[PDB]
Design a protein around this ligand. Structure first.
Ligand SMILES: */C=C/C1=C(C)C(=O)N/C1=C\C1=NC(=C\c2[nH]c(/C=C3\NC(=O)C(C=C)=C3C)c(C)c2CCC(=O)O)/C(CCC(=O)O)=C1C
Ligand SMILES: */C=C/C1=C(C)C(=O)N/C1=C\C1=NC(=C\c2[nH]c(/C=C3\NC(=O)C(C=C)=C3C)c(C)c2CCC(=O)O)/C(CCC(=O)O)=C1C
Lengths: 604, 593
């Protein structure tokens, strides 16, 4: 209900200044705020439709036509040629030039307090600063000394769009808000979007009298005035209520936009009214921009540093695994430190059909089995599909309520393979980590901080670490390939040391012939020519080309139709001696039941 | 080797300003530039050894002792009392405070609404998309701001050579946009310094270099390291080059992105021009905002890409693990994405003597020629030094023998890195011709480069390393296929065979596998007999001893022995040791017909 409000078209202005909407056609004022008549001279009635040029007193810079991209002119000096000695305070005006309309927003110079040159030492220091933490506080303190504001804080948005005050500088008399968590709903998405547009936004006095724009909708277009870039835009009464509720009288926020995303906000509070002149808003913009800059650089650098150390450790594991042929206890005991490190796990369990190799801080062997079963279950087959490369939980008691316990050691885990593939598996665990969420209340009466203690949840699985996990998926197929390769060579060796003389035949196609896949030494000896020089040979090669049509037909039939045949046939005898053997051909069971291979035993 | 020159210790200053080296212990001047005596009242002789307090007075800020980290003070007002009416103009000075020495560098204020006036440009680059659009906005923006005859954005490529991506000039002149320059033009020596001193400036090419009178410190014996001094005399090598291109004044701001040098803001004035501190701090600001934007957009788009690759990587992994039969349609439906995951033009899947060519890839015989050359003994050096996969950006350089093929396989990604064979994957990127606009390697020269593909993205290379699993996946699935084949083969035999696992004297000699023909002679079925000890007296001690003794050493035995049948039944027990990698018998084959 709240996330749906205009806020960019309230048709109201903060009374401290004046707004005018001018038709870029020739120069006539089409819309103006009720405050315009008081300071401009000509009252409301005749001021509307009047050329801006009648009140043309822009000494520094003038507006101009715009093609497509709206150009925004800075705050420069402005006068009034209607009244003799117009106000008491000095006035400055900024332009918002659009292809459809123009907008001029004026406010007092304020003067009083090179203030941009004076900002440079603070900027120059945050630039050099390591860690976001150190920067945040330097800005909080620095800006608190630079600008007046009784309370200045750094509000950081978390993943779920909730906020946390990471830094704060305030008058020792005020009760510190450092460490406070606020819901996402406190700053709705509609709001957040504007903070990427207008980056520095100040409220001079909470509970001001909103000066409305006289022709609410454009008299010639029929559309309301989209402020969005106007600094004198009237903020939502929802926020104003909330502000008044917390006893604040003045505001100034600066958007911490990092990688085109609103990372955080600089939030300033004055418990007495305060207007920050165009000069200071450009200073806070500067310090916001430098902070956004540094926080994003530090993010970038350290993300890259981590990615590399993980890769070097990932490779170390992959190689040492491919090297050793037998998975011993010491291999896995020397593997485990790093196998844990690569994902920042507290424990790791390696499974290999009925066996488990538990390492670090992991639940008991029986408990790990209870987990694996629950994961590989039919009911939980939904999770495995929706999961990316690996299955992972941040709180076990939520995804698998049956495994509500175990959470003290396995609150979070990473399971791979994602398929119910079995034999080889890997379980990375992260033990429970209790969290105190220092709230601000649970429109509301606020103040009172409620400290929500959260059990059964581990540390959030880093996306960096999750792709680092998905990367080691290879250790599973590696284990498996190495196992099948072990039993295969065993059986290939077994087969080759036989006396009966056997060959395996791969069924061909309509353009491919029936070839030999495997042949033992006992078979290759009856054919004279060695084993390696018979593999990949057509079956017609093997028997002589002087054989009876009746006998070969019987065999060819069994090959053509995938049937079995027992036929005595002469062999392709290079020497001469007539050698005849009983050709036992037997179809081997296929999953489709459609013959793919045959076994050929030779004994007459 | 050009970079061998010092450049940070020339012992010379740009004449426009004055330098002084003060003993932070004494408060006295130890070294000073020949220009110091002319500005300051006291001539060189008595100015050397004189306490700094006397000759100059600092109203805004004063120097101080430093523990370890050198502290630098900004440009603030300075007055010289040791002379009656000495201000040729207005003078401003900056400090460089070190634990061993102090350095003060002064220059005129110059004057002529700037830092506030810079803000609209910054705030605009701050939000425009693409590095291209930013580069030009800065080029144009900074030209209007400082007012140099030409402002150009120089981007360093992978091999440290530079290319002008954007340029703003006077309507007249010759455009340098698109021009490529060598790495030799800006030595590593120099580049390192532009991370140190951010904004560098030459007021007049062919100035008279004012030397520091005591060249080496009189008490330390070491020269003055001017790496942070703005009035540092630049290499005559570069000055010659500058004079050769007709430029009279320069200004070069460093585009440092994620603490690394990404580019340079190069400004040329074909008439002399001194850019005061005020402006250098403005160009620094615009350089920092550009760096900022270029690094953000890099970051955003890196993230966007990583995700689309992951979604496609997962699609491949799953569909591969699903299908059991490595069919033609399997690979034909796999290939579009198998190519996409690495942004290849072609992909070849190898499976022992066989190849599955896809996209724009060389002929089957040519692919074999490539694989052989990779798996070679001579090229075993590359495979070790390579990360997770072997990759080339120009095959003709890495594999000179494979100089051709380049039209279709100019670049490739080969996995597995080991001479593992059977399963392999080769990703290809065809040749991409590049027109290189040179500086004269002093007029127009365009170099057309053949035999090189598009640079293998580091993101795509880790995306390749990620699919390493498809190889072990193919392999596991292949061994599993032949295993079941052989397990089925042996079980349909008539001779009656069993495989025996050697018990390491802790465990007995047990049966690993048994066929139906063997399990029938023993009556009881196959699945019950697996895992049972060979111990199955009803037999002569002489005959069993022969069998036991063979098993004992790991030797073979052919002995006729009775059995346990529900008629006694005797069979010739042919035990044969199976080859082990260690050569130490681990299994035996037992056939009995
Ligand atoms: C309807 C939901 C809302 C609840 C509940 C609420 O308290 N406010 C709600 C709506 C809006 N908030 C808007 C802006 C806004 N809210 C905050 C929140 C904080 N500011 C603080 O200083 C602190 C603590 C010190 C908190 C928790 C901020 C910072 C802002 C924007 C700041 C600014 O630019 O002045 C908002 C939009 C109003 C607007 O148009 O600016 C709405 C609708
Ligand atoms: C010894 C090899 C050199 C050749 C050949 C050459 O032409 N110069 C060589 C050496 C040095 N160059 C140094 C600085 C420097 N070089 C360039 C080159 C360019 N300037 C331009 O405007 C363009 C194109 C439009 C090019 C390619 C620049 C800009 C700079 C200054 C870097 C900066 O100020 O940030 C140099 C070091 C001198 C120094 O001490 O500053 C050497 C030795």
């Amino acid at each position: 209900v709240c996330a749906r409000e205009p806020i960019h078209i309230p048709g109201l202005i903060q009374p401290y200044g004046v707004l005018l909407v001018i038709d870029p056609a020739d120069g006539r004022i089409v819309q103006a705020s009720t405050t315009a008549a008081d300071l401009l001279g000509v009252p409301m009635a005749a001021l509307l439709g009047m050329p801006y040029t009648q009140v043309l007193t822009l000494p520094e810079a003038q507006p101009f036509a715009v093609d497509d991209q709206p150009q925004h002119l800075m705050h420069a000096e402005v006068r009034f040629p209607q009244r003799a000695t117009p106000p008491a305070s000095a006035w400055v005006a900024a332009w918002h030039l659009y292809p459809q309309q123009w907008l001029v927003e004026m406010e007092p110079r304020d003067a009083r307090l090179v203030t941009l040159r004076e900002a440079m030492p603070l900027l120059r220091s945050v630039e050099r600063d390591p860690g976001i933490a150190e920067a945040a506080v330097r800005v909080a303190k620095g800006l608190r000394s630079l600008i007046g504001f009784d309370r200045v804080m750094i509000y950081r948005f978390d993943e779920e769009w909730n906020g946390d005050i990471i830094a704060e500088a305030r008058k020792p008399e005020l009760e510190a808000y450092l460490g406070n968590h606020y819901p996402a709903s406190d700053i709705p998405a509609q709001a957040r979007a504007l903070y990427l547009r207008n980056r520095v936004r100040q409220i001079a006095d909470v509970g001001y009298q909103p000066s409305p724009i006289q022709p609410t909708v454009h008299p010639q277009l029929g559309t309301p005035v989209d402020l969005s870039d106007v600094s004198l835009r009237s903020v939502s009464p929802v926020h104003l209520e909330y502000l008044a509720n917390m006893g604040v009288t003045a505001t100034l926020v600066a958007s911490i936009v990092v990688n085109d995303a609103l990372w955080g906000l600089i939030s300033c509070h004055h418990y007495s009214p305060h207007f920050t002149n165009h000069a200071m808003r450009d200073v806070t913009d500067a310090v916001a921009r430098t902070l956004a800059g540094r926080i994003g650089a530090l993010q970038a650098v350290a993300r890259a540093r981590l990615e590399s150390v993980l890769l070097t450790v990932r490779e170390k594991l992959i190689t040492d695994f491919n090297d050793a042929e037998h998975m011993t206890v010491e291999l896995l005991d020397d593997m485990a430190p790093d196998l844990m490190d690569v994902v920042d796990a507290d424990g790791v369990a390696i499974f290999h059909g009925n066996d488990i190799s538990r390492h670090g801080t992991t639940p008991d062997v029986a408990a790990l089995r209870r987990i694996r079963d629950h994961i590989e279950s039919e009911h939980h087959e939904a999770l495995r599909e929706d999961a990316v490369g690996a299955l992972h939980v941040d709180a076990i008691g939520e995804v698998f309520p049956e495994l509500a316990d175990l959470a003290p050691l396995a609150a979070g885990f990473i399971f791979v393979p994602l398929m119910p593939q079995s034999r080889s598996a890997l379980l990375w665990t992260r033990r429970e980590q209790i969290q105190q969420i220092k709230w601000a209340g649970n429109p509301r009466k606020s103040f009172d901080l409620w400290q929500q203690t959260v059990r059964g949840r581990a540390r959030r699985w880093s996306p960096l670490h999750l792709e680092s996990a998905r990367s080691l998926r290879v250790l599973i197929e590696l284990m498996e390939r190495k196992r099948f390769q072990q039993d295969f060579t065993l059986l290939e060796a077994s087969l080759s040391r036989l006396r009966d003389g056997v060959a395996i035949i791969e069924r061909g196609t309509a353009n491919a012939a029936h070839r030999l896949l495997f042949v033992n030494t006992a078979f290759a000896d009856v054919c004279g020519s060695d084993v390696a020089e018979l593999i990949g040979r057509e079956l017609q090669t093997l028997y002589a080309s002087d054989a009876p049509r009746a006998n070969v037909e019987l065999l060819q039939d069994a090959l053509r139709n995938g049937r079995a045949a027992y036929v005595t046939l002469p062999l392709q005898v290079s020497d001469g001696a007539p050698v005849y053997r009983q050709f036992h051909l037997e179809p081997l069971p296929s999953p489709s039941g459609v013959t793919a291979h045959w076994l050929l035993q030779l004994r007459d």
